[PDB]
Tab-separated table of N, CA and C in Angstrom:
chain	number	residue	atom	x	y	z
X	17	UNK	N	-24.742	-9.453	136.611
X	17	UNK	CA	-25.482	-8.677	137.655
X	17	UNK	C	-26.464	-9.541	138.497
X	18	UNK	N	-27.127	-10.564	137.848
X	18	UNK	CA	-28.090	-11.480	138.495
X	18	UNK	C	-27.531	-12.910	138.582
X	19	UNK	N	-27.704	-13.510	139.796
X	19	UNK	CA	-27.266	-14.887	140.120
X	19	UNK	C	-28.467	-15.805	140.378
X	20	UNK	N	-28.377	-17.041	139.784
X	20	UNK	CA	-29.410	-18.099	139.890
X	20	UNK	C	-29.005	-19.182	140.906
X	21	UNK	N	-29.957	-19.445	141.845
X	21	UNK	CA	-29.813	-20.437	142.929
X	21	UNK	C	-30.762	-21.627	142.720
X	22	UNK	N	-30.217	-22.856	143.002
X	22	UNK	CA	-30.939	-24.150	142.863
X	22	UNK	C	-31.480	-24.647	144.216
X	23	UNK	N	-32.795	-25.027	144.186
X	23	UNK	CA	-33.541	-25.527	145.357
X	23	UNK	C	-33.769	-27.046	145.278
X	24	UNK	N	-33.374	-27.717	146.394
X	24	UNK	CA	-33.510	-29.174	146.566
X	24	UNK	C	-34.519	-29.552	147.643
X	25	UNK	N	-34.717	-30.899	147.798
X	25	UNK	CA	-35.634	-31.526	148.819
X	25	UNK	C	-35.001	-31.649	150.245
X	26	UNK	N	-33.626	-31.840	150.289
X	26	UNK	CA	-32.789	-31.953	151.532
X	26	UNK	C	-32.522	-30.590	152.259
X	27	UNK	N	-32.327	-29.468	151.454
X	27	UNK	CA	-32.092	-28.052	151.952
X	27	UNK	C	-33.421	-27.343	152.389
X	28	UNK	N	-34.505	-27.516	151.525
X	28	UNK	CA	-35.914	-26.968	151.769
X	28	UNK	C	-36.493	-27.343	153.192
X	29	UNK	N	-36.198	-28.641	153.658
X	29	UNK	CA	-36.539	-29.187	155.037
X	29	UNK	C	-35.644	-28.536	156.156
X	30	UNK	N	-34.319	-28.319	155.782
X	30	UNK	CA	-33.273	-27.610	156.623
X	30	UNK	C	-33.672	-26.106	156.910
X	31	UNK	N	-34.400	-25.472	155.893
X	31	UNK	CA	-35.002	-24.083	155.924
X	31	UNK	C	-36.256	-23.964	156.857
X	32	UNK	N	-37.125	-25.078	156.927
X	32	UNK	CA	-38.358	-25.217	157.846
X	32	UNK	C	-37.890	-25.095	159.368
X	33	UNK	N	-36.816	-25.884	159.696
X	33	UNK	CA	-36.117	-25.955	161.045
X	33	UNK	C	-35.210	-24.686	161.376
X	34	UNK	N	-35.099	-23.725	160.362
X	34	UNK	CA	-34.264	-22.494	160.422
X	34	UNK	C	-35.100	-21.244	160.854
X	35	UNK	N	-36.379	-21.084	160.297
X	35	UNK	CA	-37.336	-19.960	160.618
X	35	UNK	C	-38.202	-20.218	161.907
X	36	UNK	N	-38.585	-21.544	162.116
X	36	UNK	CA	-39.440	-22.049	163.240
X	36	UNK	C	-38.772	-22.050	164.664
X	37	UNK	N	-37.373	-21.815	164.746
X	37	UNK	CA	-36.534	-21.710	165.974
X	37	UNK	C	-36.461	-20.258	166.541
X	38	UNK	N	-36.721	-19.241	165.636
X	38	UNK	CA	-36.744	-17.784	165.950
X	38	UNK	C	-38.189	-17.264	166.258
X	39	UNK	N	-39.232	-17.942	165.647
X	39	UNK	CA	-40.660	-17.604	165.836
X	39	UNK	C	-41.598	-18.798	165.645
X	40	UNK	N	-42.922	-18.489	165.586
X	40	UNK	CA	-44.021	-19.469	165.374
X	40	UNK	C	-44.825	-19.061	164.128
X	41	UNK	N	-45.003	-20.035	163.186
X	41	UNK	CA	-45.741	-19.886	161.906
X	41	UNK	C	-46.621	-21.115	161.674
X	42	UNK	N	-47.845	-20.842	161.138
X	42	UNK	CA	-48.912	-21.847	160.796
X	42	UNK	C	-48.558	-22.646	159.481
X	43	UNK	N	-49.131	-23.949	159.137
X	43	UNK	CA	-48.766	-24.717	157.863
X	43	UNK	C	-48.849	-23.880	156.535
X	44	UNK	N	-50.005	-23.123	156.341
X	44	UNK	CA	-50.235	-22.141	155.219
X	44	UNK	C	-49.206	-20.937	155.197
X	45	UNK	N	-48.746	-20.474	156.448
X	45	UNK	CA	-47.709	-19.377	156.678
X	45	UNK	C	-46.253	-19.862	156.291
X	46	UNK	N	-46.009	-21.190	156.550
X	46	UNK	CA	-44.757	-21.930	156.093
X	46	UNK	C	-44.657	-22.163	154.511
X	47	UNK	N	-45.756	-21.734	153.793
X	47	UNK	CA	-45.913	-21.728	152.330
X	47	UNK	C	-45.760	-20.311	151.723
X	48	UNK	N	-46.128	-19.220	152.532
X	48	UNK	CA	-46.024	-17.768	152.128
X	48	UNK	C	-44.521	-17.284	151.978
X	49	UNK	N	-43.661	-17.720	152.980
X	49	UNK	CA	-42.174	-17.513	153.034
X	49	UNK	C	-41.476	-18.673	152.166
X	50	UNK	N	-41.502	-18.562	150.768
X	50	UNK	CA	-41.012	-19.554	149.681
X	50	UNK	C	-41.815	-19.343	148.327
X	51	UNK	N	-41.784	-20.413	147.429
X	51	UNK	CA	-42.524	-20.530	146.165
X	51	UNK	C	-43.656	-21.579	146.364
X	52	UNK	N	-44.934	-21.114	146.150
X	52	UNK	CA	-46.200	-21.935	146.281
X	52	UNK	C	-46.545	-22.814	145.047
X	53	UNK	N	-46.159	-22.326	143.778
X	53	UNK	CA	-46.354	-23.000	142.405
X	53	UNK	C	-47.872	-23.178	142.009
X	54	UNK	N	-48.572	-24.154	142.696
X	54	UNK	CA	-49.983	-24.468	142.495
X	54	UNK	C	-50.669	-24.711	143.820
X	55	UNK	N	-51.268	-25.931	143.959
X	55	UNK	CA	-51.979	-26.371	145.193
X	55	UNK	C	-51.312	-27.602	145.825
X	56	UNK	N	-51.252	-27.582	147.195
X	56	UNK	CA	-50.655	-28.654	147.999
X	56	UNK	C	-49.510	-28.150	148.839
X	57	UNK	N	-49.888	-27.518	149.982
X	57	UNK	CA	-48.952	-26.929	150.982
X	57	UNK	C	-49.182	-27.459	152.419
X	58	UNK	N	-50.494	-27.751	152.801
X	58	UNK	CA	-50.946	-28.226	154.168
X	58	UNK	C	-50.542	-29.712	154.516
X	59	UNK	N	-50.916	-30.703	153.615
X	59	UNK	CA	-50.610	-32.188	153.755
X	59	UNK	C	-49.100	-32.558	153.508
X	60	UNK	N	-48.456	-31.781	152.552
X	60	UNK	CA	-46.978	-31.911	152.142
X	60	UNK	C	-46.023	-31.473	153.348
X	61	UNK	N	-46.369	-30.290	153.986
X	61	UNK	CA	-45.606	-29.698	155.178
X	61	UNK	C	-45.800	-30.564	156.514
X	62	UNK	N	-47.072	-31.107	156.716
X	62	UNK	CA	-47.512	-32.000	157.844
X	62	UNK	C	-46.853	-33.414	157.849
X	63	UNK	N	-46.599	-33.995	156.604
X	63	UNK	CA	-45.831	-35.281	156.387
X	63	UNK	C	-44.288	-35.044	156.553
X	64	UNK	N	-43.837	-33.752	156.222
X	64	UNK	CA	-42.437	-33.203	156.454
X	64	UNK	C	-42.112	-33.089	157.990
X	65	UNK	N	-43.205	-32.752	158.810
X	65	UNK	CA	-43.200	-32.678	160.322
X	65	UNK	C	-42.984	-34.060	161.003
X	66	UNK	N	-43.573	-35.147	160.357
X	66	UNK	CA	-43.444	-36.614	160.751
X	66	UNK	C	-41.962	-37.131	160.627
X	67	UNK	N	-41.234	-36.615	159.551
X	67	UNK	CA	-39.770	-36.882	159.235
X	67	UNK	C	-38.845	-36.033	160.222
X	68	UNK	N	-39.243	-34.709	160.503
X	68	UNK	CA	-38.534	-33.743	161.455
X	68	UNK	C	-38.653	-34.226	162.973
X	69	UNK	N	-39.898	-34.664	163.408
X	69	UNK	CA	-40.235	-35.165	164.822
X	69	UNK	C	-39.372	-36.367	165.347
X	70	UNK	N	-38.920	-37.253	164.372
X	70	UNK	CA	-38.016	-38.431	164.606
X	70	UNK	C	-36.506	-38.050	164.786
X	71	UNK	N	-36.040	-37.001	163.998
X	71	UNK	CA	-34.622	-36.449	164.016
X	71	UNK	C	-34.382	-35.387	165.143
X	72	UNK	N	-35.472	-34.536	165.407
X	72	UNK	CA	-35.527	-33.465	166.467
X	72	UNK	C	-35.372	-33.954	167.942
X	73	UNK	N	-35.871	-35.217	168.225
X	73	UNK	CA	-35.843	-35.882	169.598
X	73	UNK	C	-34.440	-36.570	169.875
X	74	UNK	N	-33.795	-36.974	168.722
X	74	UNK	CA	-32.386	-37.542	168.630
X	74	UNK	C	-31.267	-36.446	168.796
X	75	UNK	N	-31.617	-35.183	168.367
X	75	UNK	CA	-30.740	-33.954	168.496
X	75	UNK	C	-30.944	-33.220	169.903
X	76	UNK	N	-31.760	-33.905	170.791
X	76	UNK	CA	-32.113	-33.449	172.159
X	76	UNK	C	-33.007	-32.181	172.237
X	77	UNK	N	-33.913	-31.962	171.209
X	77	UNK	CA	-34.801	-30.797	171.050
X	77	UNK	C	-36.278	-31.234	171.179
X	78	UNK	N	-37.093	-30.339	171.794
X	78	UNK	CA	-38.538	-30.571	172.053
X	78	UNK	C	-39.417	-29.607	171.253
X	79	UNK	N	-40.397	-30.214	170.491
X	79	UNK	CA	-41.396	-29.477	169.676
X	79	UNK	C	-42.718	-29.372	170.449
X	80	UNK	N	-43.159	-28.090	170.614
X	80	UNK	CA	-44.403	-27.723	171.307
X	80	UNK	C	-45.455	-27.302	170.283
X	81	UNK	N	-46.581	-28.043	170.355
X	81	UNK	CA	-47.764	-27.871	169.476
X	81	UNK	C	-48.906	-27.326	170.367
X	82	UNK	N	-49.493	-26.171	169.902
X	82	UNK	CA	-50.604	-25.457	170.586
X	82	UNK	C	-51.981	-26.140	170.232
X	83	UNK	N	-52.945	-26.502	171.257
X	83	UNK	CA	-54.222	-27.246	170.956
X	83	UNK	C	-55.226	-26.513	170.032
X	84	UNK	N	-55.607	-27.265	168.924
X	84	UNK	CA	-56.616	-26.812	167.895
X	84	UNK	C	-58.017	-26.707	168.550
X	85	UNK	N	-58.819	-25.660	168.190
X	85	UNK	CA	-60.130	-25.377	168.858
X	85	UNK	C	-61.245	-24.960	167.877
X	86	UNK	N	-62.523	-25.267	168.313
X	86	UNK	CA	-63.768	-24.830	167.655
X	86	UNK	C	-64.115	-23.428	168.232
X	87	UNK	N	-64.089	-22.424	167.308
X	87	UNK	CA	-64.274	-20.962	167.556
X	87	UNK	C	-65.766	-20.484	167.636
X	88	UNK	N	-66.720	-21.394	167.227
X	88	UNK	CA	-68.190	-21.149	167.190
X	88	UNK	C	-68.922	-21.550	168.510
X	89	UNK	N	-68.566	-22.772	169.046
X	89	UNK	CA	-69.143	-23.317	170.305
X	89	UNK	C	-68.265	-23.091	171.567
X	90	UNK	N	-66.919	-22.825	171.355
X	90	UNK	CA	-65.943	-22.654	172.456
X	90	UNK	C	-65.178	-23.940	172.801
X	91	UNK	N	-65.774	-25.136	172.352
X	91	UNK	CA	-65.206	-26.520	172.556
X	91	UNK	C	-63.729	-26.621	172.076
X	92	UNK	N	-62.905	-27.210	172.973
X	92	UNK	CA	-61.431	-27.334	172.776
X	92	UNK	C	-61.064	-28.788	172.478
X	93	UNK	N	-60.360	-28.943	171.313
X	93	UNK	CA	-59.870	-30.242	170.817
X	93	UNK	C	-58.383	-30.443	171.153
X	94	UNK	N	-58.009	-31.738	171.404
X	94	UNK	CA	-56.602	-32.167	171.725
X	94	UNK	C	-55.625	-31.939	170.542
X	95	UNK	N	-54.338	-31.478	170.867
X	95	UNK	CA	-53.236	-31.148	169.870
X	95	UNK	C	-52.970	-32.314	168.894
X	96	UNK	N	-53.169	-31.998	167.576
X	96	UNK	CA	-53.134	-32.967	166.474
X	96	UNK	C	-52.165	-32.536	165.349
X	97	UNK	N	-51.859	-33.561	164.518
X	97	UNK	CA	-50.967	-33.413	163.336
X	97	UNK	C	-51.899	-33.287	162.084
X	98	UNK	N	-52.318	-34.452	161.458
X	98	UNK	CA	-53.299	-34.482	160.294
X	98	UNK	C	-54.677	-33.828	160.718
X	99	UNK	N	-55.299	-33.020	159.794
X	99	UNK	CA	-56.506	-32.209	160.121
X	99	UNK	C	-57.886	-32.883	159.740
X	100	UNK	N	-58.987	-32.929	160.689
X	100	UNK	CA	-60.371	-33.407	160.318
X	100	UNK	C	-61.149	-32.355	159.460
X	101	UNK	N	-61.969	-32.839	158.483
X	101	UNK	CA	-62.814	-31.957	157.586
X	101	UNK	C	-64.151	-31.473	158.274
X	102	UNK	N	-64.544	-32.256	159.342
X	102	UNK	CA	-65.757	-32.074	160.206
X	102	UNK	C	-65.454	-32.495	161.666
X	103	UNK	N	-66.146	-31.807	162.657
X	103	UNK	CA	-66.060	-32.083	164.132
X	103	UNK	C	-66.835	-33.422	164.564
X	104	UNK	N	-66.194	-34.486	165.338
X	104	UNK	CA	-66.919	-35.766	165.770
X	104	UNK	C	-68.097	-35.599	166.811
X	105	UNK	N	-68.047	-34.452	167.558
X	105	UNK	CA	-69.019	-34.066	168.602
X	105	UNK	C	-70.174	-33.160	168.066
X	106	UNK	N	-69.816	-31.975	167.418
X	106	UNK	CA	-70.786	-31.007	166.854
X	106	UNK	C	-70.978	-31.203	165.296
X	107	UNK	N	-70.887	-30.077	164.469
X	107	UNK	CA	-71.106	-30.051	162.970
X	107	UNK	C	-70.256	-28.968	162.249
X	108	UNK	N	-69.675	-27.992	163.049
X	108	UNK	CA	-68.866	-26.839	162.595
X	108	UNK	C	-67.522	-27.176	161.911
X	109	UNK	N	-67.344	-26.429	160.791
X	109	UNK	CA	-66.129	-26.491	159.933
X	109	UNK	C	-65.100	-25.354	160.290
X	110	UNK	N	-65.406	-24.618	161.432
X	110	UNK	CA	-64.615	-23.502	161.980
X	110	UNK	C	-63.711	-24.013	163.129
X	111	UNK	N	-62.544	-24.489	162.662
X	111	UNK	CA	-61.447	-25.029	163.506
X	111	UNK	C	-60.199	-24.160	163.218
X	112	UNK	N	-59.524	-23.769	164.349
X	112	UNK	CA	-58.263	-22.976	164.354
X	112	UNK	C	-57.062	-23.953	164.231
X	113	UNK	N	-56.103	-23.625	163.291
X	113	UNK	CA	-54.919	-24.475	162.961
X	113	UNK	C	-53.805	-24.477	164.073
X	114	UNK	N	-53.213	-25.725	164.545
X	114	UNK	CA	-52.135	-25.783	165.618
X	114	UNK	C	-50.810	-25.028	165.246
X	115	UNK	N	-50.022	-24.595	166.296
X	115	UNK	CA	-48.761	-23.839	166.115
X	115	UNK	C	-47.581	-24.741	166.468
X	116	UNK	N	-46.590	-24.735	165.545
X	116	UNK	CA	-45.367	-25.562	165.653
X	116	UNK	C	-44.157	-24.678	165.967
X	117	UNK	N	-43.467	-25.057	167.079
X	117	UNK	CA	-42.256	-24.373	167.623
X	117	UNK	C	-41.201	-25.392	168.084
X	118	UNK	N	-39.901	-24.974	167.972
X	118	UNK	CA	-38.731	-25.768	168.382
X	118	UNK	C	-38.000	-25.047	169.512
X	119	UNK	N	-37.797	-25.805	170.626
X	119	UNK	CA	-37.113	-25.314	171.836
X	119	UNK	C	-35.857	-26.142	172.129
X	120	UNK	N	-34.752	-25.387	172.366
X	120	UNK	CA	-33.418	-25.960	172.700
X	120	UNK	C	-33.148	-25.951	174.229
X	121	UNK	N	-32.999	-27.279	174.857
X	121	UNK	CA	-32.717	-27.624	176.382
X	121	UNK	C	-31.229	-28.263	176.611
């Protein structure tokens, strides 16, 4: 009545490029749709984006990243990959996370 399925490192990356073509999801949201286990979803998915960005430009596809911002002062920061723990200009730890999308041309 019940069937067991095996999860690998090569298919799990193929699944990231499968949901992100129909909609837009944040690094923590790309952890909710799967198994979380313990801690380590933000830095693991962001290093997975560095491996996808090199293959995605070779397949003739463009990835659009939305600019990260400070929600307390209104100050707008340039679109980034790896995340800062503190702001270089102000002092606020209230930064909004960038959005990753795949577009076919």
